[PDB]
Each structure stands twice: as structure tokens, then as C-alpha cells.
Design a protein around this ligand. Structure first.
Ligand SMILES: Cc1cc2nc3c(=O)[nH]c(=O)nc-3n(C[C@H](O)[C@H](O)[C@H](O)COP(=O)(O)O)c2cc1C
Ligand SMILES: Cc1cc2nc3c(=O)[nH]c(=O)nc-3n(C[C@H](O)[C@H](O)[C@H](O)COP(=O)(O)O)c2cc1C
Ligand SMILES: [Fe+3]
Ligand SMILES: [Fe+3]
Ligand SMILES: [Fe+3]
Ligand SMILES: [Fe+3]
Lengths: 410, 410
């Protein structure tokens, strides 16, 4: 298919793929995304940095062809860089190798085995293992590699185009957005940063300590000031790299708002009434509230709002001695994300209605603790809340909101 | 339920309902909304303006009680205003009347029949039919009524509190947003105006000519300069009324961007490949694209983007001589919304794949014309597009984008 490349610097093009139609990936929702791949034209060698998901290469090849024509060059790739083995960025590597079998493939040591396990036709491909601070010369353009294990896979690495300071960061600093506009400043800031927050919350939270360590290494290497553009593998290219670095710094150190995220499920509406009553009390103190109903809403938006919330409420009715099962999905997600690794133990309350022996709230409190929250109280009641019982929820919310505002903003 | 009112002026409170959990209403999707009701404390009479959806009054009554406490007044309503009979704003009128059976109910003539048909217990209620420019005195505060038939129901009207210039406009100027923040300036502008655009597109488009007439009447009344706050029945209160009046003016006169909305469905992916190829051609001219896949996406977001798009593409495969049935839903919606009433005949193309006698694209072209679009071309092809057939889609998109940019920005 015919598809035009987008120039991002002299001799550097975006040749990625617009996945207009995807609505879910990993455990998170979205309204399309991109698989960003880049073509760098040196005097001697043309380098392709990352590629795209299996079966979506038609756009990529069209843009690569378009870029070579604009450069007056043959349709030829001399160098292949694979920052990350996950298949939304490597899925076309077998195609690329089959068309250019002599082009070396630069990747990390553990990436070789991962790529071969994904794509057995790559066994015997000219892999060239790289380590941090190693560089290849393309002819007037230099690519420098920086290893980034567990950011977000063991195989991950960054590639820096030194002369213009363009950091190809793969997933790091990406956002799941699919626009015709390619750069951060070309879309509304609120959309950009909300998507950055969702991306961090769902993929980077458990790596928060590795983020700070990598930031400390980049600073001591003197490399931070040499980064003028961050070109991630999903979403917008950052012409303001410090904006997203500052965001990651905030998220990794627990900088939160006077904000509470309330999550609940219900069968007959009683736990829902309690959840709304807790919100009224919280709002009476000027503290913000996000309200999620697990019947309708899903984990990826919930954890987005938890990321900059100082407190997290979870409620569910008791059903055969256990909390309603929908909470198990979120709890298992929170056990993997480990929000306590941001440096903050967010406050929490457990609540629900019951009709017999109860116990669901007890379980929720235990799980909220296993997930790294500081549970301050529990409240379980019988069937439909009375007027006074909703006032108790209001009072509990108010007291929580007071504590939220006294917690110092990290 | 305990719930705090929000003061919006001296002696004026928001006593509405936060519908945190609703995700669909009318024919549109949402992430919660509010049912805004307002309490006006005159020296002599307390007036409640609109109310809420049936079964959701607990918050409203809590805020009414709170407002009376803050004013040092009796828990008492002296006057009831019903701007609009639709039940998300009248659902609690039977409750309010049963509690304060002597409080007159001010509404339009045709509203009386509608409210009694909705709520038979209101037969015999102290209705007081009002007409435009009639006023009532609350004791230092005046409410002036302005009829607004078919904005958006025949029964609709606005209520103006003259001394502070607060226009209670019911659905007009509303947006489906559910935040703890009550005012326009307290949330990101992009969210506010995108929600305003969706509300207009889905509810106001066929009334575009009545909007301009009502604007012309308000101006000739010398009344536009007397409006300092627009307090709608959904979403945020406008402290900058001219911002939303300007937006309505643009939408009602066809002011669009260099933007194309593309909608398609597919069974085997061929129509999808065509849609993506049309987008590449459009983007090669710098024209924006929104891409919607009817399997995953729904009508209310589609028509939001059509509202400020200069062109609309629609594609579907042929199935037993007809286009894939999902297009029938959108077409029936566009038949009701009548985008040509904005003063603009948006450009359009019909396309799709076929496997036999075809004819689907023929049908799409006819329906796009019945819906008020200017169909420029059709393109139907056999099974999977070839390389050259995708280039034709690209070329057609490119030529369309040229015409789009030549269309004068109304
Ligand atoms: C977001 C994400 C996080 C992951 N975390 C881990 C991990 O912590 N440990 C691990 O061994 N594999 C991890 N993986 C790798 C998956 O287990 C691996 O890709 C697996 O083959 C996926 O299996 P599937 O095809 O059934 O989805 C992660 C993958 C993703 C996408
Ligand atoms: C957005 C909207 C637009 C409407 N437009 C019309 C209309 O054009 N003509 C009409 O007679 N009724 C119109 N109605 C009224 C509905 O037909 C009426 O409320 C009906 O009783 C709804 O039936 P239902 O309860 O089965 O939804 C409209 C209602 C809504 C919410
Ligand atoms: Fe990844
Ligand atoms: Fe990725
Ligand atoms: Fe309405
Ligand atoms: Fe309404």
C-alpha cells in the first residue's frame, strides 16, 4: 500500500504504523495506537529502528519506500536495530531479514534468544549483540546504545542518534494514541498527559525504582542534556523531553493530588449507595473523587486514576462468604503493579453490604494491605443502608479526606 | 442521604445529582453525567428549578436540606420551575409535589400535558402556565421565563434570574460530564469543549436553524449582554457564557476543520484496507483523519467528529446485494440529525469490496445523499485490493483532501 513517511529531522523519518482500529492490548483499553519505527539515512548506511506488529507491515513498507525515494536512495536497509523483542515492535523482523538478509540486527544479548523463540526463521540471522555506550557509525550519523533491562522487559534498550539528540526509547515514554499528528505539541496537552499517565500506571508502576535508577545513570553519564527529542515506540514524539521525564519523576516518587479513587461492585445497589455516600463526605472537604463501577468499568482506567490519588476505596457485597468476584481481577492487577514501589503507601478503606455472616470487607482489607495500601478502616452493614448508616459513610469519607490533605505531597 | 449543596451566587445553590455510573443515554455513550437542579432563595419564596431522574432524588434532597441550613431557612420549597418535561429533569416532580402540594409549578402550556402523561399523580397539581417574557418575584430576586420550543423538545423553556444574569437553559449548552468540579474553568478546556461538541452533534444538530433564530431573538431583546452565567441541566456551569454561545454559533453555521471522518465495516478486511488507503491519501495533503470501525465503535462519537469535518467517507462490503447492515444504524441516525441544516453540504465518498454482483456502494451513495452529503465518487472492487487498487484509494483520498482544503471555512 502507498503510505507517506514523516520527516522528523534531516535524514530521519517516522516509518511507523497507525493501528486505527485496535481497542485492547495487554490488560488495557485504548482507541487505537501506533507502532513507531524510524529510518535513519547516514551517508553510508540506512538504519531501521524497530518495526511493527505481525500482519501490519503494509504501512511500514510503504513509508520506507517513500522515504528512500525522497532521499533519492535505493529501497534498501543496511542496518536493523531491535530495541525490544515484544511483537508489537519486532513482528516484522522476519520479513525485514528475508528482504535484507545481510543487514546486521543490533539488539541486547538476551534479546537474541527471545527473538529466535518468537520467530524461528531468524535462527542464523546476523545478530550483533550490543552493550551500553557502544556506537555504530552510519556516515555522518551515530547511533549509541543504552541498555534498559526491565524497562519494560529484560531485553529492552534505548538507541540515541547523537548528532540531533533523538532518543529512540521504545516503550518508555510512549502513549497509546493514534493521531495523524506525530508530535507532542500538535495535540491537546490534556490528552497527551492523560495518556502518558495511563501508560505509566499500567506498564511502568512496578518499575518505578528502576526508573529512578536509570534517571540517575543518565544524569551522571551527562546524557540528559544531550537528549533533545524522545521518539518512543507508541504515540507522540516528545519535542519537549523534560516534560515527560518530569512526569515519570513525579509518578515514580509518589507525587499525588488531593484525590480519592472509589471502586465498587454491587448486585442489589446497597454497596453502590455506600460508595456514593463516601464520596459526598470526601467532597465536603474539597477533595476530588473518581467513581468506578466494576460492572461497567475496567482495570486500566482505574489504575490510571489510582496513580495520582492519595487514597483508594474498594467495596463489594459478600457472596457465599467472599467478596463479589469482580474485585479479584483488580486485586490481581494491583498485586502485579505494586503501587507502593512509587514510595507512597496510599490510604484505603474497605466497605460493603452483607446479608448473613458477612466477611467480604475483611477479605478486601487483607488484600488492600497485600497490595501496598494503608487500610485505615472497614465498614460492613446489613442489606440496605439506613439514613444514619449513609451518614456514617459520609463521616468516614470526610475524616479520610482530612487525612488526605494532611499527607505531604511527595 | 447527606450531600452538600454548592453555592453559585448569593442565595443561589446547585442542588443537583451526580450520576457517576451511567454509561449510555438517548443514543449516546457517556462516562457519567449530572442532572443539575438549582435552588433560589428569595426574601419571600424559595424556588427549585428542575430536578432529576426517577429514583435518583436522594442526593437532591440532601443538598436542598443543606442549602436551607446554610441559609438559616426552613426546609421548604415555595415555587417549582419545570423547564423541560423529559424525565431526567422532571423525574422527581411527583415527589416534590407530594411534599409541597401548594407550591405552584411553572411550565409551558404543552408541558402540562406531557408531565401529566408521564406522572398521572400530578393531575390536579397547581400548574401555572407561563409564556415568554413573563416574570415572577421571589423577594429581591426575579425569574423571567423564555420559551424555547424544540430546544430540544416542544415543551422546553429557559429561566433567567435577572439580577445576577444567570440563565437556567436546561439541556441547551449542557454537556455530559460528571466531575466534582461544577464550573467550566475548573476542568481542562479540551474536555469541556469536546463534551460540548458531542452534546451539540447528537442532540442539537437538527435544530441548528432554531438555534440561530433563538440567538437572533435574544440579541434583539438586548438580552445577550444581560447573560453573565449559563447554568445548564447537564455538566458544567458556564462562567464564560460567550464561549459556549460562540461554539453553538460555529456548529450552527457549518464552521469545520480540514478534517475527514472515515467510517467502515468489514467481514474479511478488504474494506478496512481500502479505508486505511483513503486515509493515507488524505493525510498526504495535510488533512486530518478520524477512523471509525463500526464493529467496535458507535454512532455518538462518529457524529461528534462529523460535526466539524468537511468530508465523510462511508464503506462496507456487499452481502446478499445490500451493504453490511451495521451502516443502517448510522444512516438512520444521520437521517434524524440532518447535518445539512448546519448550512454545509459535507463532501462524501462511498466505497467497499464485493464478491459477486456488488451494488452495496450504490446503496451507500444514495443514502449519503438522502442524509445531506455531497457524494463525489464511488469505488467498489473485487475481494482483496491489489497494490494498484490501494493506490487508487490513495489517489481518490488525495484529490478529496485537495477539495476539502479549497472549501471555504464557514
Ligand atoms: C506488560 C507485560 C509484562 C510482563 N511481565 C513479565 C514478567 O514479569 N515476568 C515474565 O516472566 N514475563 C513477563 N512478560 C512476558 C509474557 O509472559 C510473555 O510475553 C508470554 O510469552 C506471553 O504469553 P501469551 O502469548 O499467552 O500472552 C510480560 C509481558 C508483558 C506484555
Ligand atoms: C433526543 C430526543 C429526541 C426526540 N425527538 C422527538 C421527535 O422528533 N418527535 C417526537 O414526537 N418525539 C421525540 N422525542 C420523544 C420520544 O419519542 C418520547 O419521549 C417517547 O415517549 C420515548 O419513548 P420510549 O420511552 O420508548 O423511549 C424525542 C426524545 C428524545 C430524547
Ligand atoms: Fe512492550
Ligand atoms: Fe510496545
Ligand atoms: Fe432533554
Ligand atoms: Fe436532559
Amino acid at each position: 500500500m502507498k503510505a507517506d513517511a514523516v520527516k522528523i529531522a534531516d535524514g530521519v523519518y517516522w516509518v511507523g504504523v497507525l493501528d486505527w482500529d485496535i481497542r485492547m492490548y495487554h490488560g488495557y483499553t485504548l482507541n487505537g495506537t501506533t507502532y513507531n519505527a524510524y529510518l535513519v539515512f547516514g551517508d553510508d548506511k540506512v538504519a531501521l529502528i524497530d518495526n511493527t506488529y505481525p500482519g501490519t507491515s503494509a504501512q511500514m513498507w510503504g513509508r520506507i519506500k517513500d522515504a528512500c525515494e525522497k532521499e533519492g536512495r535505493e529501497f534498501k536497509i543496511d542496518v536493523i536495530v531491535q530495541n525490544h523483542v515484544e511483537k508489537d515492535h519486532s513482528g516484522a523482523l522476519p520479513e525485514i531479514h528475508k528482504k535484507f538478509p545481510e543487514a546486521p540486527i543490533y539488539c541486547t544479548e538476551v534479546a537474541v534468544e527471545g527473538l529466535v523463540k518468537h520467530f524461528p526463521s531468524l535462527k542464523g540471522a546476523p545478530f550483533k549483540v550490543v552493550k551500553s555506550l557502544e556506537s555504530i557509525d552510519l556516515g555522518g550519523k551515530t547511533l549509541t546504545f543504552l541498555e534498559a533491562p526491565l524497562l519494560h522487559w529484560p531485553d529492552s534498550m534505548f538507541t540515541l542518534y547523537a548528532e540531533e539528540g533523538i532518543l529512540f526509547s521504545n516503550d518508555a515514554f510512549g502513549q497509546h494514541l493514534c493521531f495523524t499528528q506525530r508530535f507532542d505539541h500538535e495535540i491537546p496537552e490534556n490528552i497527551l498527559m492523560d495518556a502518558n499517565q495511563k501508560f505509566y500506571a499500567n506498564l511502568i508502576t512496578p518499575l518505578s525504582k528502576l526508573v529512578l535508577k536509570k534517571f540517575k545513570e543518565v544524569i551522571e553519564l551527562g546524557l540528559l542534556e544531550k537528549i533533545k527529542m524522545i521518539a518512543p515506540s507508541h504515540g507522540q514524539i516528545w519535542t519537549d523531553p523534560m516534560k515527560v521525564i518530569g512526569a515519570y519523576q513525579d509518578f515514580a516518587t509518589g507525587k499525588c493530588k488531593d484525590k480519592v479513587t472509589i471502586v465498587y461492585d454491587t448486585m442489589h445497589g446497597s454497596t453502590q449507595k455506600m460508595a456514593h455516600a463516601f464520596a459526598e463526605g470526601i467532597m465536603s472537604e474539597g477533595v476530588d473523587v473518581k467513581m468506578y463501577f466494576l460492572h461497567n468499568d475496567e482495570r486500566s482506567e482505574i489504575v490510571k486514576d489510582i496513580l495520582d490519588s492519595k487514597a483508594f476505596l474498594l467495596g463489594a457485597p459478600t457472596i457465599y462468604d467472599e467478596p463479589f468476584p469482580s474485585v479479584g481481577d483488580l486485586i490481581y492487577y494491583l498485586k502485579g503493579l505494586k503501587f507502593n514501589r512509587t514510595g507512597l503507601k496510599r490510604l484505603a478503606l474497605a466497605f460493603g453490604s452483607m446479608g448473613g455472616n458477612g466477611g467480604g470487607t475483611k477479605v478486601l482489607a487483607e488484600k488492600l494491605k497485600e497490595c501496598g495500601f494503608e487500610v485505615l478502616d472497614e465498614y460492613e452493614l446489613y442489606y440496605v443502608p439506613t439514613e444514619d448508616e449513609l451518614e456514617k459513610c459520609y463521616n468516614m469519607g470526610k475524616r479520610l479526606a482530612v487525612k488526605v490533605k494532611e499527607m505531604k505531597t511527595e
